[PDB]
């Protein structure tokens, strides 16, 4: 099932959305994240995203709700289609491969400046076939591990 380290890591991920640290993710905090991922969702779109995770319908996402989704979806095998959306966030030029520069771009936008050596290490870790880049199959493994 879900391990105690997965719980801790899902909580760290939650806290990166929950930027004022009040224990609930608002549409406003969700907006901040989506924009740093290169998107610009409207208020209606932000509220409808909240609907996906907000189980009691109070308009925000608390950690138990966030955890319920993360834990349930990881047991799923039918998230290919969502991972494909996640892929396109990284693959900015749309060429089917995530480059070092594309990886660093997304990482620095989320609040992490990495050296050219650190980005290379991440690509190297994910790169199974050796083209020095990340295709979809390799990206699945880096979102699924």
């Amino acid at each position: 099932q879900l391990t105690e380290e997965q719980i801790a890591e899902f909580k760290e991920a939650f806290s990166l959305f929950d930027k004022d640290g009040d224990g609930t993710i608002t549409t406003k905090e969700l907006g901040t994240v989506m924009r740093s991922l290169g998107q610009n969702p409207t208020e209606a779109e932000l509220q409808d995203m909240i609907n996906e995770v907000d189980a009691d319908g109070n308009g925000t996402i608390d950690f138990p709700e966030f955890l319920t989704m993360m834990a349930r979806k990881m047991k799923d095998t039918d998230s290919e289609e969502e991972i494909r959306e996640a892929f396109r966030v990284f693959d900015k030029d749309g060429n089917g491969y995530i480059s070092a520069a594309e990886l660093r771009h997304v990482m620095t936008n989320l609040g992490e400046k990495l050296t050219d050596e650190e980005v290379d290490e991440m690509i190297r870790e994910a790169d199974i076939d050796g083209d020095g880049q990340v295709n979809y199959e390799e990206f699945v493994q880096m979102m699924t591990a």
């Binding site: 890591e9 899902f10 760290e12 991920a13 990166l16 959305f17 969700l30 994240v33 989506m34 991922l37 998107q39 969702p41 779109e45 995203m49 909240i50 996906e52 995770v53 966030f66 989704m69 993360m70 979806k73 998230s79 969502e82 991972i83 959306e85 996640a86 966030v89 997304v106 990482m107 989320l110 992490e112 991440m122 880096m142 979102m143």
Partner: peptide
């Protein structure tokens, strides 16, 4: 879109760590 963002944020933090 939201779950994609959640997976990404998880990857991001664990990349930092």
């Amino acid at each position: 879109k939201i779950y994609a963002a959640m997976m990404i944020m998880d990857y991001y933090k664990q990349s930092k760590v």
